[PDB]
Amino acid sequence: EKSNIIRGWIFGTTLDSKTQSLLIVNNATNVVIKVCEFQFCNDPFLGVESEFRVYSSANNCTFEYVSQPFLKNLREFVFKNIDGYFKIYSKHTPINLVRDLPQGFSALEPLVDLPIGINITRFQTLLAL
Amino acid sequence: QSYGFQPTYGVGYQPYRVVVLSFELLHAPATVCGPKKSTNLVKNKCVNFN
Ligand SMILES: *[C@@H]1O[C@H](CO)[C@@H](O[C@@H]2O[C@H](CO)[C@@H](O)[C@H](O)[C@H]2NC(C)=O)[C@H](O)[C@H]1NC(C)=O
Ligand SMILES: *[C@@H]1O[C@H](CO)[C@@H](O)[C@H](O)[C@H]1NC(C)=O
Ligand SMILES: *[C@@H]1O[C@H](CO)[C@@H](O)[C@H](O)[C@H]1NC(C)=O
């Protein structure tokens, strides 16, 4: 990271104005989590928050959550589905390497679990500059 | 039709407020539950615990 950039993720079976889906986003102040229908017309992005543009549209949502200012530097994640539960794990570690993942051992301690009860089959990353 | 809720009528005429609630099937993990008990702890005694 060293620069943020990667500010969230999008998940769902269909994310083009059909089928319920999930959304996870950050701006270093809080996490904002939604389970709502979306279309993502033009690939959300910062675009420069001197300049900002909101993603997709407001629609038939079913869940929400906000908490925890989320914070070379490397961060690690895991996402998985378990019969209705959506789990997220993570870790932090500063590194010297610049090419790719270094060696060494890293065990991801868990974050809070979400009992959404909706499938996921695709995902894509939110970005910023 | 507009309601004629005049005060000068009997109980049958007088307005009431109604709330109807229902719950969904177990297609996913539950999310609403009644409050759970939180009893005082015990130490150095043989006890049943949950
Ligand atoms: C960007 O950060 C701001 C904080 O400066 C977040 O503002 C909160 O947004 C949630 C969701 O709309 C509201 O419920 C809170 O009331 C807002 N806080 C304040 C102080 O207004 C905002 O959510 C963040 N946005 C993203 C995309 O992460
Ligand atoms: C909104 O989404 C929920 C998801 O379970 C669905 O049950 C409901 O029918 C949807 N409503 C509309 C108007 O699309
Ligand atoms: C996932 O999709 C299957 C069909 O492949 C469906 O039967 C099931 O109800 C869906 N479950 C969730 C949690 O979306």
UniProtKB/Swiss-Prot annotation, chain B:
Residues 27-49 are annotated as: Disordered. Changing residue 4 to S: In strain: Omicron/BA.1. Binds to host ACE2. RBD also interacts with the N-linked glycan on 'Asn-90' of ACE2. Cleavage of S generates a polybasic C-terminal sequence on S1 that binds to host Neuropilin-1 (NRP1) and Neuropilin-2 (NRP2) receptors. Interacts with host integrin alpha-5/beta-1 (ITGA5:ITGB1) and with ACE2 in complex with integrin alpha-5/beta-1 (ITGA5:ITGB1). May interact via cytoplasmic c-terminus with M protein. May interact (via N-terminus) with host bilirubin and biliverdin, thereby preventing antibody binding to the SARS-CoV-2 spike NTD via an allosteric mechanism. Attaches the virion to the cell membrane by interacting with host receptor, initiating the infection. The major receptor is host ACE2. When S2/S2' has been cleaved, binding to the receptor triggers direct fusion at the cell membrane. When S2/S2' has not been cleaved, binding to the receptor results in internalization of the virus by endocytosis using host TFRC and GRM2 and leading to fusion of the virion membrane with the host endosomal membrane. Alternatively, may use NRP1/NRP2 and integrin as entry receptors. This is Spike protein S1. It comes from Severe acute respiratory syndrome coronavirus 2.
